[PDB]
Structures are given as C-alpha cells and as structure tokens.
C-alpha cells in the first residue's frame, strides 16, 4: 500500500499569512493525488484535485503543486472560516490512502470573554437535580480560569468544562463550566458565583445568583 | 443539489453488526460509485471500499474482507454498508462518498465529492438513553452590555451524538454549541448557547431544536426570560 506522510501534522498562524502543507508519498503517484479539507463537525471536503487542479466553488486562495512524491497545499491568504484539518489523498492505486492530516489553527489578538451564568431551571429541579451554567463568550487565547463560589466557599470536584474549537469568523474560543448539585444541596445555599480569570480582564470578572430571585 | 444522506448514530454491542445506509439524491444514480471512508477517534481518514450500483460489484479494503458487505438498492437511490463481528476499535464516523470513475485522474468526478454527513456507530454494551431537555433562560445575569445570552442544557445522553440547531436553521448566527461532556454515571451531557439583543428579548422567539437519533428523541424548547 502507498503511505501518504503530512508534515506538519499542526500549524498556527495569521489572518493573512501564506501557508505551505506537504505531502509525501512512499512512491511515485504521478498527478495522482488530492486535498481535502475538514471543517468542523462537517464532511471532508474537495478543495484540489489532480494534485493542482482547483475544484469548482473552492476559493482559490487554495492551490496545489508538485508531482512524483512530494506535494504541497498552499494557502496564499489564510482566513479564519480556513480553520479546519487538511488532508491528502492518493488515487494512484487502492486501496487509497490519506495522509495523517494537518491540523491548521488562527493566531489572532487578545479578547476578553464576556461571561454569563444561568441558574438551574425551574423544570430541572423538579427532577431532583440542579445544574448551574457559566459561559465564558468568545475570548482568545483559551487559557481561562473558572472558580466556582457557593455562599462565598470555594468549589471543587462538582463542575465540568467544555470549549469549542475556534470560531469560524472571528476565531475566539467559548468555554462552558456546569455547576452540578443535587436539589437538596442546591436549597441548602444562597449565592452562587462563578469567577473567572483572563488575560484580556484587568481583573477577574464574577458573575453571581441569590437562589430564588 | 447533489446530496449524499445517511441514516443516524447506532449503538452496538461487540459482536454485532451495524447497517448504514446513503440515500443519493440529485444525480444519476447508476452512473457514479459510491464508497465507504471511516474516521477513528484520531481522525485519521480509513478507505473502506466501493459498490459499483450499476453492476453490483464491489471491491473492499483487505482490512475489512469477510466482515464489510456493500449492496444498494437502485430502485430507491441507496447504498449500504453493512460491518459485521463488530469491535472495540470500529467506533468511528462512517462516511459515504461519491465517486465519478477510476481511471483518469484529470477530472474532477473521479474524487471523493459530494460525501454524506457521516454516521456515528459506538460499539458498547451499553443500553440508549435519551437526553432531558433544558432552557437556559436569559436573565439580568445573563445580559451584558446590550447583549443576552441563552441556551438550552442537554443532560444525560448516551450514545454520542446529540445535534441542536435553533429556530429550525434559521438562526445560526451567534451560535455555539458545546462539545459533549463525559458524566462519571457514564452518560453524555452538551448546551448549546447563542447571544442575542437584549432589547427584543420579548418579541422575538428562540427554540431549541435537539436531535438525539440513537433513542430517537427530538425536542423542541421554546426559551424565554424567566417572570
Ligand atoms: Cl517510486
Ligand atoms: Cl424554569
Ligand atoms: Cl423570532
């Protein structure tokens, strides 16, 4: 079988920038090969064909080049709708092979991240079960610190994080921190409080709740 | 529009064999192939094999001979994918894929394009479960600066994945959905938030819309402010 090596298997860089992918094929393919791209939570995508050809409806920022077994995608003008995992692909022989992808990443300016939080809803709680929600919105870098406060004490080992990838528009990251309790220890406190800590706050921002109002 | 559509995430337990299905729409179905790529937790991209839904014959990857069955069905546009002795490591996103011809690189039929959304097929044990649906109401701790944020929390789902659009596709601006969480009961929990004006939160409408094909749930959650 043919192997398709990519390198780098990750790359940061800016709006704007020109950007070069390889790939390198274990045998000669020819023309013989095409890149795709994969956007978040979608499909791969045909971007290149033919190893320079420009699939219809692809921006032409993107463009392929070389022969034989070394190719290279290049991104003359990086956007960030381009944040995405490319991949190459060989149709020289099957079974047909990709390369291991490369992960492309946007280094953009400080934001801070606006910050929300939402108490458990009426339904939830009847269900016996409390989560309390804090959103960090739309902040770069990702490094963020969320601290959980509940009557001014301190949270440990009752939330879990998630983040998003970076946004296709503005590629800032979102972080969600979900506070559970049962009702009972819900009811058992008044002011609930997440705290959160960027680099783009001069300080740290808390937002908070009294349970009830 | 040429469109590759597949049938939704499965749960199966080792052993067992899952059937996914493409249903092709918007182009001559007999005259293109249709192939099988899969994508492990890694993300690498796997080829499987072809169909040809003209002949019927097919053509698999030797690491899937004697356990992947291609058939189609022209009389409804469709393709299958049948894997059977399911294990651990065929958890994966299974993808559908159009594919022109075999023999002249020069053209842009004969590339994987258009592909199908992807199926989702977990190997576990494990029995489905259906998410409960939650609104995260917009409040004055939850309005910044003219804006207000909302969502809706999905608790307690198993297998991945659950998928939320809000208004029925309508409203995709502002829009982000969270990657699921793993809960320690072994159950899946995501929200999916948008930030709106703060000043029509009483005339405009936003519902969540949230799809959990495993156990076949669908849930629509009007959110409004909280009286
Ligand atoms: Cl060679
Ligand atoms: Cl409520
Ligand atoms: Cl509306």
């Known amino acids: 079988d043919i192997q398709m090596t990519q390198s780098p298997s990750s790359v940061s860089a800016s709006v704007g920038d020109r950007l070069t992918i390889t790939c390198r094929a274990s045998?000669?393919?020819?023309?013989?090969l095409a890149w795709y791209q994969q956007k978040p939570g979608k499909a791969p995508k045909l971007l290149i064909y033919?190893?320079?050809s420009l699939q219809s409806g692809v921006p032409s920022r993107f463009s392929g080049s070389g022969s034989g077994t070394d190719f290279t995608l290049t991104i003359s003008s990086l956007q960030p709708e381009d944040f995405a995992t490319y991949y190459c692909?060989?149709?020289?022989?099957?079974?047909?092979?990709f390369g291991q992808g490369t992960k492309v990443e946007i280094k953009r300016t400080v934001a801070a991240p606006s910050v929300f939080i939402f108490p458990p809803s009426d339904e939830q709680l009847k269900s016996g079960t409390a989560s309390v929600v804090c959103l960090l919105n739309n902040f770069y870098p990702r490094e963020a610190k969320v601290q959980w406060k509940v009557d001014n004490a301190l949270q440990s080992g009752n939330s879990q994080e998630s983040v998003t990838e970076q946004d296709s528009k503005d590629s800032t990251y979102s972080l969600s921190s979900t506070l559970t309790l049962s009702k009972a220890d819900y009811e058992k406190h008044k002011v609930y409080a997440c705290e959160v800590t960027h680099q783009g706050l001069s300080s740290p921002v808390t937002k908070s709740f009294n349970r009830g109002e | 529009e040429v469109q590759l559509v597949q049938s939704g995430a499965e749960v199966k337990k080792p052993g067992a064999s899952v059937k996914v299905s493409c249903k092709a729409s918007?182009?001559?179905?007999?005259?293109?192939?249709m192939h099988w790529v899969r994508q492990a937790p890694g993300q690498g991209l796997e080829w499987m094999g072809w169909?040809?839904?003209?002949?019927?014959?097919?053509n698999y990857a030797q690491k899937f001979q004697g356990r992947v069955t291609m058939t189609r069905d022209t009389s409804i546009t469709t393709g299958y994918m049948e894997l059977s002795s399911l294990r651990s490591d065929d958890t994966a996103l299974y993808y559908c894929?159009?594919?022109?011809?075999?023999?002249?690189?020069?053209?842009?039929?004969?590339?994987?394009?258009?592909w199908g959304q992807g199926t989702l097929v977990t190997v576990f044990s494990a029995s489905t479960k259906g998410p409960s649906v939650f609104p995260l109401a917009p409040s004055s701790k939850s309005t910044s600066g003219g804006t207000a944020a909302l969502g809706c929390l999905v608790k307690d789902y198993f297998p991945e994945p659950v998928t939320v659009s809000w208004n029925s596709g309508a409203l995709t601006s502002g829009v982000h959905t969270f990657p699921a969480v793993l809960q320690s009961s072994g159950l899946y929990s995501l929200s999916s938030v948008v930030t709106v004006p703060s000043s029509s939160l009483g005339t405009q409408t936003y519902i969540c819309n949230v799809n959990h094909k495993p156990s076949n749930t669908k849930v629509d959650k009007k959110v409004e402010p909280k009286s």
């Open positions: 169909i040809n839904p003209n002949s019927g014959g097919t």
């Open positions: 692909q060989q149709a020289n022989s099957f079974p047909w092979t």
């Open positions: 045998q000669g393919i020819s023309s013989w």
């Open positions: 033919a190893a320079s």
């Open positions: 894929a159009r594919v022109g011809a075999h023999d002249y690189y020069d053209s842009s039929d004969n590339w994987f394009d258009p």
């Open positions: 918007g182009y001559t179905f007999t005259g293109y192939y």
